[PDB]
Amino acid sequence: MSELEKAMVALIDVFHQYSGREGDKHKLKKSELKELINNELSHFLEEIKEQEVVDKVMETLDNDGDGECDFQEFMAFVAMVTTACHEFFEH
Amino acid sequence: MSELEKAMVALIDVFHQYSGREGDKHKLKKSELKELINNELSHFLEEIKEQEVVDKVMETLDNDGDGECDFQEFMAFVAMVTTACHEFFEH
Amino acid sequence: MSELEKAMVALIDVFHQYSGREGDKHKLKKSELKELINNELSHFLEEIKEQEVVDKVMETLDNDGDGECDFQEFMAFVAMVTTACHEFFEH
Amino acid sequence: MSELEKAMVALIDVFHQYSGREGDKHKLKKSELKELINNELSHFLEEIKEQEVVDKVMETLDNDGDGECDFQEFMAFVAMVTTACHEFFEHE
Amino acid sequence: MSELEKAMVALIDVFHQYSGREGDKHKLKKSELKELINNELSHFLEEIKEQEVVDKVMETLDNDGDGECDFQEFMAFVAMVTTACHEFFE
Amino acid sequence: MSELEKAMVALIDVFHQYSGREGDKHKLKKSELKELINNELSHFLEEIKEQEVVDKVMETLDNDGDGECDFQEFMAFVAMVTTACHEFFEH
Amino acid sequence: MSELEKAMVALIDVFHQYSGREGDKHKLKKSELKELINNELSHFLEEIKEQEVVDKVMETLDNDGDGECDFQEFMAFVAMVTTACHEFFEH
Amino acid sequence: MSELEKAMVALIDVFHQYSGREGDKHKLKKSELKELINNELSHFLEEIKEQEVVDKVMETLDNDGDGECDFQEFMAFVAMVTTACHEFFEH
Numbered sequence: 182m183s184e185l186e187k188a189m190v191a192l193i194d195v196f197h198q199y200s201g202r203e204g205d206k207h208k209l210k211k212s213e214l215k216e217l218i219n220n221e222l223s224h225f226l227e228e229i230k231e232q233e234v235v236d237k238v239m240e241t242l243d244n245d246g247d248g249e250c251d252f253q254e255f256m257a258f259v260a261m262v263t264t265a266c267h268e269f270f271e272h
Numbered sequence: 273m274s275e276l277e278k279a280m281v282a283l284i285d286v287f288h289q290y291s292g293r294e295g296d297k298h299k300l301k302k303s304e305l306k307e308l309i310n311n312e313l314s315h316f317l318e319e320i321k322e323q324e325v326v327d328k329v330m331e332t333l334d335n336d337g338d339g340e341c342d343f344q345e346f347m348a349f350v351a352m353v354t355t356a357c358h359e360f361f362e363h
Numbered sequence: 364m365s366e367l368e369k370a371m372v373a374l375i376d377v378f379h380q381y382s383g384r385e386g387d388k389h390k391l392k393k394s395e396l397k398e399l400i401n402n403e404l405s406h407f408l409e410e411i412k413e414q415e416v417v418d419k420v421m422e423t424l425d426n427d428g429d430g431e432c433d434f435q436e437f438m439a440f441v442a443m444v445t446t447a448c449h450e451f452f453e454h
Numbered sequence: 455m456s457e458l459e460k461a462m463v464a465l466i467d468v469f470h471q472y473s474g475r476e477g478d479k480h481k482l483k484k485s486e487l488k489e490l491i492n493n494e495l496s497h498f499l500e501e502i503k504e505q506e507v508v509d510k511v512m513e514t515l516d517n518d519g520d521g522e523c524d525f526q527e528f529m530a531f532v533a534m535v536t537t538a539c540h541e542f543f544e545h546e
Numbered sequence: 547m548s549e550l551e552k553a554m555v556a557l558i559d560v561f562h563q564y565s566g567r568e569g570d571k572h573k574l575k576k577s578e579l580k581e582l583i584n585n586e587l588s589h590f591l592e593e594i595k596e597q598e599v600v601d602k603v604m605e606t607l608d609n610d611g612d613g614e615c616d617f618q619e620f621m622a623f624v625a626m627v628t629t630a631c632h633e634f635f636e
Numbered sequence: 637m638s639e640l641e642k643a644m645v646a647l648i649d650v651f652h653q654y655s656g657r658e659g660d661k662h663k664l665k666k667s668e669l670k671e672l673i674n675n676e677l678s679h680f681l682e683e684i685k686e687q688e689v690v691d692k693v694m695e696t697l698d699n700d701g702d703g704e705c706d707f708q709e710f711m712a713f714v715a716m717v718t719t720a721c722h723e724f725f726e727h
Numbered sequence: 728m729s730e731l732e733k734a735m736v737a738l739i740d741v742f743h744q745y746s747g748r749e750g751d752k753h754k755l756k757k758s759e760l761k762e763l764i765n766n767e768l769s770h771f772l773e774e775i776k777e778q779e780v781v782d783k784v785m786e787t788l789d790n791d792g793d794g795e796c797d798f799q800e801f802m803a804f805v806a807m808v809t810t811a812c813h814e815f816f817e818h
Numbered sequence: 819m820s821e822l823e824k825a826m827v828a829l830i831d832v833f834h835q836y837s838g839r840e841g842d843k844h845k846l847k848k849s850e851l852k853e854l855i856n857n858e859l860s861h862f863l864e865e866i867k868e869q870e871v872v873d874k875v876m877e878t879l880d881n882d883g884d885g886e887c888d889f890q891e892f893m894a895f896v897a898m899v900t901t902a903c904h905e906f907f908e909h
């Protein structure tokens with residue numbers, strides 16, 4: 182598989198890894214999203230330490246309004262974060 | 273780097289491997305997109321062998337209608353392809 | 364170690380994670396096999412929830428007729444599931 | 455994905471890596487199998503140098519006569535090496 | 547660095563990792579040796595569950611009688627274990 | 637496999653890569669030992685350029701008097717060289 | 728990621744481990760640089776315990792005159808130390 | 819060893835692997851430097867396909883003018899790349 186293909190499997194893996202911890206095994210609840218952001222995105226995002234911050238992140242990602250982040254919402258989240266960090270190269 | 277962050281860097285790297293070939297070095301033109309798909313997504317997608325199919329993929333991805341795929345749009349494509357793969361893994 | 368070499372070791376390690384829980388530490392009994400499948404093959408296989416399903420899985424895997432799955436029989440099951448997954452990535 | 459599920463995908467991945475280089479993209483020809491063994495099994499197996507050795511491994515693995523190793527045949531190879539490794543280790 | 551030189555540094559590093567956990571930072575006391583064996587040699591050695599067993603392992607390794615395993619003593623243990631592994635090719 | 641276990645296998649691997657050159661493929665003769673030192677211990681040890689230096693190393697290592705270095709004897713050489721290197725990082 | 732790539736990220740990570748303790752989270756004040764040296768270079772460098780050694784090291788590393796060590800400046804320190812280590816292995 | 823110590827040994831190791839191939843075994847000639855960048859900086863850097871690219875990189879790094887990069891000069895390059903990576907993660 183190419184490196185791009187392996188990158189896509191890794192996105193699915195990390196999602197499974199956190200979404201399967203608690204409750205709904207196919208979505209991230211606020212707590213799981215907090216742990217994903219803090220443990221897996223520490224070079225791209227500041228550590229989330231206040232519930233207002235977890236709440237706004239989740240409010241932003243949660244387009245179906247169920248209070249959780251499903252896989253499609255997580256892919257959009259990754260797209261936003263990666264797009265943002267790639268703007269570094271856009272000058 | 274986490275495996276998530278490595279995936280994110282891979283996505284940026286592969287995008288540029290193809291985007292910088294011609295014209296705007298931060299967008300994929302149709303020829304660059306065709307090559308990316310054919311060389312980097314050979315296990316997940318059918319090889320593109322017809323200009324018509326190339327036009328249709330770009331028409332689908334090109335959300336801002338500038339005729340090219342920028343990195344935001346490329347992320348949306350990756351998310352679509354990832355999604356297809358993720359379906360295989362929910363049982 | 365290469366990714367292949369680590370993968371071979373991971374197959375050994377998972378077999379023993381389960382085989383050593385109960386009874387003979389070198390074989391998977393039904394309950395161990397059910398737990399391995401349910402916990403470690405959840406994205407590749409439907410969860411096993413009924414004794415009758417467990418029984419038929421063991422019956423296919425248990426070639427030598429001792430009522431359990433030994434390492435070699437487990438390697439055959441791994442080759443079966445892997446071949447199934449490999450049929451996916453054919454393009 | 456579990457460690458087991460990752461290990462299965464890593465088997466598919468390495469197969470692809472070598473099978474797609476030359477000729478039939480869905481099979482390892484002798485040179486492709488040689489490379490895979492020398493680059494990816496370079497801690498479990500001795501480097502294959504002599505052609506005769508390459509020839510013999512392929513004859514071991516090639517069950518359908520076509521002179522190449524397909525994925526199914528490669529999985530039987532993987533089981534052979536994993537078993538050898540299993541016998542190398544302690545389990546008590 | 548060759549694969550041999552890198553192996554050597556890895557041996558130094560694992561000894562460091564465990565020798566620094568309690569007491570004398572340069573030696574493995576019995577608890578530290580038990581943990582290294584159980585955490586880092588799980589594919590080559592039986593897990594140690596009994597104190598008799600780790601006392602016996604240390605008695606064997608402990609050539610200067612201080613009741614701990616220093617690095618030179620650790621290298622000897624590594625030599626024994628690797629030589630035993632190698633018996634697989636005998 | 638742990639880094640320590642990886643190390644142990646590397647040690648077996650290099651020994652065989654040299655021992656297998658000539659004569660007994662399970663032992664290092666003087667020429668093979670010289671080559672191992674010069675090519676694999678180039679950063680820990682001064683290059684051997686003198687027959688007397690070779691002779692001396694082998695006399696030190698060879699404990700069963702066959703005039704060669706088997707694996708067990710090589711492990712003793714490894715212990716010795718590593719130990720000397722460790723003390724160098726010592727507080 | 729290659730070993731080189733992972734090593735570069737490890738440099739960023741240890742820097743931040745100590746840089747974020749106090750004050751500017753993006754620079755090392757002398758107390759922080761001291762602790763970094765004392766805790767993460769314990770096998771390469773003798774412990775610093777005198778004001779003047781810290782003062783001396785910081786004056787060497789400080790090129791923009793803020794009395795702190797930013798990440799670029801830290802990289803000159805890393806270069807110095809590593810070059811020093813490389814010289815021990817060249818013999 | 820700490821993560822920082824191992825990172826430092828990794829930097830010296832990668833230098834040894836590439837500097838050893840051709841000519842002066844203690845320095846990187848331009849072909850060696852191209853190989854290192856293409857093989858070891860492949861996730862962070864663009865592939866060098868145009869010879870004028872290593873030519874200009876060497877131009878900057880060579881400060882004793884043997885037209886090659888020694889370890890010292892190599893560390894400056896590692897600073898430059900690592901610093902860019904830091905700024906990239908700095909958003």
Ligand SMILES: [Ca+2]
Binds near residue numbers: 200201205207
């Ligand atoms: Ca959940």
Ligand SMILES: [Ca+2]
Binds near residue numbers: 251
């Ligand atoms: Ca939602």
Ligand SMILES: [Ca+2]
Binds near residue numbers: 292293297304
């Ligand atoms: Ca372009």
Ligand SMILES: [Ca+2]
Binds near residue numbers: 334335337339340
């Ligand atoms: Ca567009």
Ligand SMILES: [Ca+2]
Binds near residue numbers: 384386391
């Ligand atoms: Ca059992």
Ligand SMILES: [Ca+2]
Binds near residue numbers: 432
């Ligand atoms: Ca059976």
Ligand SMILES: [Ca+2]
Binds near residue numbers: 473486
């Ligand atoms: Ca082929």
Ligand SMILES: [Ca+2]
Binds near residue numbers: 496497500501649
């Ligand atoms: Ca090898």
Ligand SMILES: [Ca+2]
Binds near residue numbers: 517
């Ligand atoms: Ca065949």
Ligand SMILES: [Ca+2]
Binds near residue numbers: 569573
């Ligand atoms: Ca201790």
Ligand SMILES: [Ca+2]
Binds near residue numbers: 607608610612615619
């Ligand atoms: Ca002792």
Ligand SMILES: [Ca+2]
Binds near residue numbers: 658659663664
């Ligand atoms: Ca020999």
Ligand SMILES: [Ca+2]
Binds near residue numbers: 697698
């Ligand atoms: Ca002998």
Ligand SMILES: [Ca+2]
Binds near residue numbers: 746753
């Ligand atoms: Ca600070």
Ligand SMILES: [Ca+2]
Binds near residue numbers: 791792793796800
């Ligand atoms: Ca400063």
Ligand SMILES: [Ca+2]
Binds near residue numbers: 837
């Ligand atoms: Ca050179």
